[PDB]
Design a protein around this ligand. Structure first.
Ligand SMILES: CCCCCCCCCCO[C@@H]1O[C@H](CO)[C@@H](O[C@H]2O[C@H](CO)[C@@H](O)[C@H](O)[C@H]2O)[C@H](O)[C@H]1O
Ligand SMILES: N[C@H](CC(=O)O)C(=O)O
Ligand SMILES: N[C@H](CC(=O)O)C(=O)O
Ligand SMILES: N[C@H](CC(=O)O)C(=O)O
Ligand code: NA
Ligand code: NA
Ligand code: NA
Ligand code: NA
Ligand code: NA
Ligand code: NA
Ligand code: NA
Ligand code: NA
Ligand code: NA
Lengths: 416, 422, 406
């Protein structure tokens, strides 16, 4: 059965299974007897994340010039900010069509300390990479791996045979590791149809029943807005750089479906990278840098979930956001999506920062704190679709930057 | 550059047996004569150094040997080796509880404690998922062996795949990586050998401290617990291990003389995981087993195959249940076999975890450790002599790991018969 | 240029702390010093592990063993001299005699065993240098043994492994040099922040402590280091000129362990020591060889007892020499840890830090200027590591005599 089209079978069936079990009251059998298999699928991808990030980027940063890496960053970051900003802008319009939370009708009454930005930045530079590796801190690994692979290529270009042979040997240890990791990613993706089925079956069972109210109308709204981001911003950007966007989606889909049901960008980095190499044809000089960075700081789906649910609260308490306030949201939902860790649920946690920025404080027991908790009740329903666009923008950004740097192997894009 | 240097000249297997016998005589003297606090202060640190040294080697020598060994074998074999070692571990655990129950009733442990007592899916799955690590750098830093065993097996297998490629580039990268582990494994096994120079001293100290602290306590019905447990541990070795060993054509007397360094070390460190470096170096040099086997069976067995604990748990549960005037019926002892096997599989390879898990074995037959009850009193009588019993069991926990590794090896033709001829 | 940022930042921070903009300096200049510290920090664990595995293979145990026996004997004697200087310099300045406070008239072994790691992957993640030092020696010693095997097969495995450490060390030393491009800025920021916050406080008998502590630190360099250096035939003006990057990085980061990458690259590029030496003596000395701490402790211990009217007797000052040496060995190589350990030196002559007591006030006067004293302290903590590594290296002929000629 076509493995491009079989992981898609597990997604649908688990969704029907979980919706059916959820609508019929067996979600506790699904948590006990089905949830563990998706958890196994999650643990397997998780173990690959730290080595496959470290090794691919040491290799990739050696296997390219600094000035390219530097131009890749400036390019990928210019793309990343603007695709995030467009996501906020799309959620705001999609939130109004669906008219989210206007019928929740809570009275509220007429109404900062922004987190230090510098310490988050200094936090990029690790102070012990063995610790950042053991703690799982991807962004500090990205920094050390680039710094390291850059130094390895410098040492490969030295007059000594003794120095060249030591540095070149080190780089082979990383190349040996990276090639081994991409191998297992492909092997675990044999189980991927099952883990997908279990995760979506557990999720649909627990919060299926909850997608029935104006929360259901929220879900309708968030998924619609995510879609526009793809078919408008990604397809147009993809088609703009001469990439058949249908060939792009057809290649991304393994990374999209694991992103969806694991609700973790960082947890689906291995599939996103293996998709970026085998299917997409990107060179490690590119995706070994952009794909892990984007798993953290490029969350188009979160920046749009945050845009849609922020309108839901202000409507739900009778203090709708003015225009001048929605323009603060574009700034601050981008900032919060940059800050959102790539693990399940962290986007809701960061949504608070976005409210605190427009003057909707979450004082406990207040009407605002009530609307926030209506959202967190369907968070997994919205979490799946959110992480998917967080990854898809990482691939569309990697593929687009690659065709710009001549680092895209066009032999992989031929319907024959 | 010191003043004095004279040690290190004797058969280390014979001198490690010298430190064990002498330390037991020494600690017993401080016990009945009251210098047990000098031994904890002035002798225990040497046994502690010997433990830290073996401890530093565990994570590299498991990771490297199993990456090496797992690349150096075919998966369809590895899967059959696992199936073989796993069925052996279960049957021998079941056999140990079966022996502890029989040896426990023969010695009749705790039948005369005379405490009055009033006549009055969910949990295992996460333990399995937890075998799969979610970050191996962390599982390494945290010391999580079973997650590393998993990663190491999974890794080396991928390395052999890459060594078989049309590319000269992929083959040589994998081939290079594989050398780093092989380089690491050989360096670890080297240091194991250097450290085992200190082992006659470290063995002497550990047994001297334990015998000093808990010697005095082995005088009462706890002494009869000791009598039962050692008798069963002895029976488990000379009956089930010897009969099992001889059935597959291994001289059981040759096994013990090769195992002894691991046996004596497991005994005095009371930690399977802590005697793994000696257990593997013994599996290679003395036993003649190939890294394709013991790099998997020896770390897997240090955790999940505890024959010595599974017999300890059978004897002490009979001791407690007899001690409250509600002796165990047969139908319960068949639950003890079911549940002490389960609880011995769960017992971590650290000193004392068998008592901590012994509680789970009691909870399974209806002896709750509610505070102030008679039951909690008998459990604490056991925890009072746990070290005296901890030594003898970890010896049989490890002795059974070597016996299982060698027996599985000869069925896969992977044992070097040149060490067994003379 | 690292020496210009040090001068300019100190003049700058003194001015800002004098217009009350020390919180403007903490807000807008301290981060550059923190980047420079995080950058140097990331390198310590790899560049220590790799350099010592390499260096320990590339030398004989009996040398390493004799180097150790030599470096440890050097380490003790130079430390003991510092306290004797702090006692003399603290007594010369008569520190804290005008504080006039009335006072009432009437596990070590585990730290040793702690050197032996129990999981080296963990000791790596934790930043525990000394347990890595032990494992790296134990490892690298094993590699040459396997490279000195009859096998072609094992010779190539270990030779492969050793190259991984050599490849890593060479990248580490490379990055240290690149990070030192930023160092003129990071130095400026750190000294500007410290001068801003604690400048104002060098004004009282605290000023005389700063005067006293720095004066003795200088003698340790210009007397004991220079005399010992000249005794083994090393030009001290060429030495300091080579040491300076490690000195000034140690000065403004107040972390010996944080200056390890600069101290080692100075030991290789500038000094010319072989990894068989400095990859063992320099990380060992960052922890246990603190001349600068032992002199602070001698001067400030005199400061407390004078400030409370129970001056130390001779028999007591001779306990300070023993115990300020011991406390400097125990002081971690991070900012401030010498002050924390000064407490153990006070308790050693009977100045207990019972809360609210007169003793506890003099301690807190000292902790108010700790950073002003911490900078000068960590500088002589590494400066003594370089001087001894070079001196011990020349005794094992492992010093490159070509870098000391023009
Ligand atoms: C006890 C026996 C009960 C039998 C079933 C009765 C339960 C109520 C209807 C069930 O159908 C679901 O419930 C919501 C009904 O409101 C829909 O919400 C929503 O569904 C979309 C989003 O999923 C939104 O766009 C829609 O506006 C909104 O109707 C939802 O989709 C639909 O699947
Ligand atoms: N699901 C997480 C966080 C979120 O849901 O916002 C991610 O993008 O990786
Ligand atoms: N001694 C422990 C378990 C126990 O205490 O029984 C071991 O085998 O590692
Ligand atoms: N500054 C620290 C400790 C101290 O202040 O003494 C060091 O030298 O490493
Ligand atoms: Na974006
Ligand atoms: Na992303
Ligand atoms: Na983010
Ligand atoms: Na068993
Ligand atoms: Na065992
Ligand atoms: Na166990
Ligand atoms: Na010294
Ligand atoms: Na020092
Ligand atoms: Na110290």
């Amino acid at each position: 059965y076509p493995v491009l089209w079989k992981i898609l079978w597990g997604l649908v069936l688990g969704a029907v299974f979980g919706l059916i079990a959820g609508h019929f009251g067996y979600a506790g059998a699904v948590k006990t007897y089905i949830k563990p298999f998706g958890d196994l699928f999650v643990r397997l991808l998780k173990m690959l994340v730290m080595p496959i990030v470290l090794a691919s980027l040491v290799v990739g940063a050696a296997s390219i010039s600094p000035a390219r890496l530097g131009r890749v960053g400036v390019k990928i970051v210019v793309y990343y900010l603007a695709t995030s900003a467009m996501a906020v802008f799309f959620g705001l319009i999609v939130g109004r069509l669906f008219n989210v939370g206007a019928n929740v009708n809570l009275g509220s009454g007429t109404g900062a300390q922004p987190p230090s930005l510098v310490q988050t930045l200094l936090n990029i530079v690790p102070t012990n990479p063995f610790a950042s590796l053991a703690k799982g801190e991807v962004l500090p690994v990205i920094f050390f791996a680039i710094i390291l692979g850059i130094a390895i290529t410098y040492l490969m270009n030295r007059n000594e045979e003794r120095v060249r042979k030591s540095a070149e040997t080190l780089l082979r240890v990383f190349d040996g590791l990276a090639e081994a990791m991409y191998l297992i990613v492909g092997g675990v993706m044999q189980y991927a149809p099952i883990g997908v089925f279990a995760l979506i079956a557990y999720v649909m069972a627990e919060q299926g029943v909850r997608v029935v109210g104006p929360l259901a109308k929220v879900v309708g709204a968030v998924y619609t807005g995510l879609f526009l981001q793809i078919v408008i911003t990604y397809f147009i950007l993809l088609k703009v750089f001469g990439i058949d966007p249908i060939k792009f989606i057809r290649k991304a889909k393994d990374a999209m479906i694991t992103a969806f049901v694991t609700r973790s960008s960082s947890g689906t980095l291995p599939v996103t990278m293996r998709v970026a190499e085998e299917e997409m044809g990107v060179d490690k000089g590119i995706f070994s840098f952009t794909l892990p960075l984007g798993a953290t700081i490029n969350m188009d789906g979160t920046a749009l979930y945050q845009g849609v649910t922020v309108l839901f609260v202000a409507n739900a308490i009778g203090h709708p956001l003015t225009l001048g306030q929605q323009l603060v949201v574009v700034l601050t939902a981008v900032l919060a999506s940059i800050g959102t860790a790539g693990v399940p649920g962290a986007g809701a946690i960061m949504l608070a920062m976005v409210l605190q920025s427009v003057g909707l404080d979450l004082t406990p027991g207040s009407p605002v704190a009530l609307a926030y908790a209506m959202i967190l009740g369907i968070d997994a329903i919205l979490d799946m679709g959110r992480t998917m666009v967080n990854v898809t923008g990482d691939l569309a950004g990697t593929v687009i930057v690659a065709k710009t740097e001549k680092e895209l192997d066009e032999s992989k894009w031929i319907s024959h």
